[PDB]
Amino acid sequence: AETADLSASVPTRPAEPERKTLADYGGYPSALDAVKQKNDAAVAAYLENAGDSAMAENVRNEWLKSLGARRQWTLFAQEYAKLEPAGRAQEVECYADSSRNDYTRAAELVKNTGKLPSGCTKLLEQAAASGLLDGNDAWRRVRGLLAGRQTTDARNLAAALGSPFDGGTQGSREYALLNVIGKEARKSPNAAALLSEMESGLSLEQRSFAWGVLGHYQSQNLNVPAALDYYGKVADRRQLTDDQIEWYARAALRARRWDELASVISHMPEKLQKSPTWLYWLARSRAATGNNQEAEKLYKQAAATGRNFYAVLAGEELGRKIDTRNNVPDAGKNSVRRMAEDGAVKRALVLFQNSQSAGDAKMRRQAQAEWRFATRGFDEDKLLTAAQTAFDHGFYDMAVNSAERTDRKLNYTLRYISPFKDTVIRHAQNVNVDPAWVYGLIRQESRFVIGAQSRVGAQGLMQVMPATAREIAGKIGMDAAQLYTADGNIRMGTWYMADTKRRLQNNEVLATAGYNAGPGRARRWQADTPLEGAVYAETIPFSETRDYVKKVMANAAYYAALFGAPHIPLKQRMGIVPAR
């Protein structure tokens, strides 16, 4: 019965002057070194003076980790009581419980098969020594730690469970299994023959795990028939790590074995079965075996996960199309202004502007942390207001970070911003690439930060490598130094998108993957037969590039809807990746 509106409510946390903010930032590295050197007076003095900021909260967390490890419980409790509950680091939670000898968290944590922080690691050991850990899960954690070379943590965990590596029957058997599950032993052409010899003397759990390690190695190496052979010997698939079981599912997906795929996904942990990825592929598998009613319900849940690659593909199997109409008005200019007056928002903004006039990347990273801190507790209305507040200040990446956090109130123009439009459109049309794809790529590469610079030296909005820029500029009459202007950067990036596409059989999925990892790697990941675009994207071995391709293609689907481009469903945009 009511038309949509946006609450003008804004927080009014106490603000501090520009000088104080920059002084607190000035002393921030000193306070973190005081924690590491155990200078408790120097840490207390910093916290006494500092504002209620991400800086203070980060110092307080680090100090509590130090206080917990040193069993300084009087101080720990007094300072823990000063942390916003949502601001508590994971390891600080564990110390706070281990301080009471409370092991409620261990049942969840024990599911983790990789490195935890030391406080959580000790909590698990103490839970193990106390008989409070499920045996199945505890030994599974031991094996996972051995397979990812955390041999010390595995050793201590096995000791605490009462069967040490040096003495225990189960302990020493787990440890001996490294001749198969070791980082280099798993690569051996004889690992399977070795394992097949020892099968008689291993438990069902140890055998399931060990075939899991060999399957996962083969699978992430894109040797699918060998992967499927080893994974097929796993008797209890629930024994696998999360990464092992997902690469079993990726192998079966790449082989189009829909019955096996469904079966694998059914053995995943609940959190993993409910992710957009495995809801979608289980749905596709159910449809492929003839159960449309079950596939339909699974598509609906995948589609309800929000704005993302699999949610969009699911919505399309249900004949929905992307709709990018905002369902709430823009925030009023007054509210946008008042939002910037809030003490924590203003702090973020002060670090932001000061980082611009000084070229200071580390200060800019701190402005982002302050912005996330400032906005951490916001309801949907404040988040849309804050998003516009960031956008107006040119803090474009924080504009998007706030907007993409809403669930019912949707502002697609803050989720999918498009600054520099004249530039991008012109240069994309000149080399004949789709502008929605270009924005998709920029949104993922740099979140629209003109001065973005990666670790390895990828530069600008389109994150073009200096070497690539030199090769481009010599083909199209440019100076390589134009890499460092926004216009030259967009000219080179859009050209390289067109160029990689042309050299990867005109395929936008291979091109996206080639942009990020090199066209050489994009071709390596091709199969000897054609692959549906989503299968290729899901089975990319490098995690960063796998994530990257799906986000860019999903971003392009939303930009295309925002720009009014003619409707090409995401499935069709994904197309078919050809044989190598």
Ligand X SMILES: CC(=O)N[C@H]1[C@@H]2OC[C@@H](O2)[C@@H](O[C@@H]2O[C@H](CO)[C@@H](O[C@@H]3O[C@H](CO)[C@@H](O)[C@H](O)[C@H]3NC(C)=O)[C@H](O)[C@H]2NC(C)=O)[C@@H]1O
The binding site for ligand X (CB under 6 A) comprises 454-456, 458, 463-465, 468, 496, 515-521
Work out what residue 487 binds among ligand X, Zn ion, none; the CB cut-off runs from 5 to 8 Å by kind: Zn ion
**Residue 311 in tokens:** 């949610």
> 3-state class of 496 per DSSP?
helix
Q: Which is nearer to ligand X, 104 or 432 (CB)?
A: 432
Contact with Zn ion (CB under 5 A) among 389, 402, 463, 489: 463
Work out what residue 19 binds among Zn ion, ligand X, none; the CB cut-off runs from 5 to 8 Å by kind: none
Interface mask toward Zn ion for 472-491; x: CB under 5 A:
---------------x----
The residue number whose beta carbon is nearest to ligand X equals: 518
Tell me which residues in 486-515 interact with Zn ion (CB under 5 A). 487
Shortest Å distance, C-beta 483 to ligand X = 10
Residues belonging to the chain: 580
State the DSSP H helix or E strand holding residue 437, giving kind and residue range, or none if neither. helix 435-446
Work out what residue 453 binds among ligand X, Zn ion, none; the CB cut-off runs from 5 to 8 Å by kind: none
Shortest Å distance, C-beta 481 to ligand X = 16
Work out what residue 87 binds among ligand X, Zn ion, none; the CB cut-off runs from 5 to 8 Å by kind: none
Work out what residue 402 binds among Zn ion, ligand X, none; the CB cut-off runs from 5 to 8 Å by kind: none
> 3-state class of 532 per DSSP?
strand
Q: Which of 181, 135, 127, 174 is nearest to 155 (CA)?
A: 174
Work out what residue 78 binds among ligand X, Zn ion, none; the CB cut-off runs from 5 to 8 Å by kind: none
Work out whether 445 is an interface residue with Zn ion (CB under 5 A): yes
User: DSSP secondary structure string, 315-338?
Assistant: HHHTT-------SSPPPPHHHHHH
487 appears as a binding residue in the annotation: yes
Q: Which is nearer to ligand X, 290 or 520 (CB)?
A: 520
| Cβ contact 570:293 at 8 Å | no
Work out whether 170 is an interface residue with Zn ion (CB under 5 A): no
* Separation of alpha carbons 548 and 512, rounded Å: 8
Q: Which is nearer to ligand X, 339 or 442 (CB)?
A: 442
444 appears as a binding residue in the annotation: yes
* Separation of alpha carbons 145 and 143, rounded Å: 5
216 appears as a binding residue in the annotation: no
Q: Which is nearer to ligand X, 56 or 510 (CB)?
A: 510
Rounded to the nearest angstrom, the gap between the alpha carbon of residue 91 and the centroid of all alpha carbons in its chain is 20
> 3-state class of 56 per DSSP?
helix
Rounded to the nearest angstrom, the gap between the alpha carbon of residue 78 and the centroid of all alpha carbons in its chain is 34
Residue 407, Cβ density class (10 Å: 0-12 exposed, 13-18 middle, ≥19 buried): exposed
**Residue 9 in tokens:** 């409510």
Q: Which is nearer to ligand X, 330 or 487 (CB)?
A: 487
Q: Which is nearer to ligand X, 165 or 548 (CB)?
A: 548
Q: Which is nearer to ligand X, 81 or 456 (CB)?
A: 456
User: DSSP secondary structure string, 456-487?
Assistant: T--BTTTTB-HHHHHHHHHHTT--GGGGGSHH
Which residue in the block uniquely carries the two structure tokens 């390891």?
A: 91
- Binding-site ranges for Zn ion (CB under 5 A): 340, 445, 463, 487
Q: Which residues are annotated as a binding site?
A: 267, 393, 427, 444-445, 487
Q: Which residues are annotated as a binding site for Zn(2+)?
A: 267, 393, 427, 445, 487
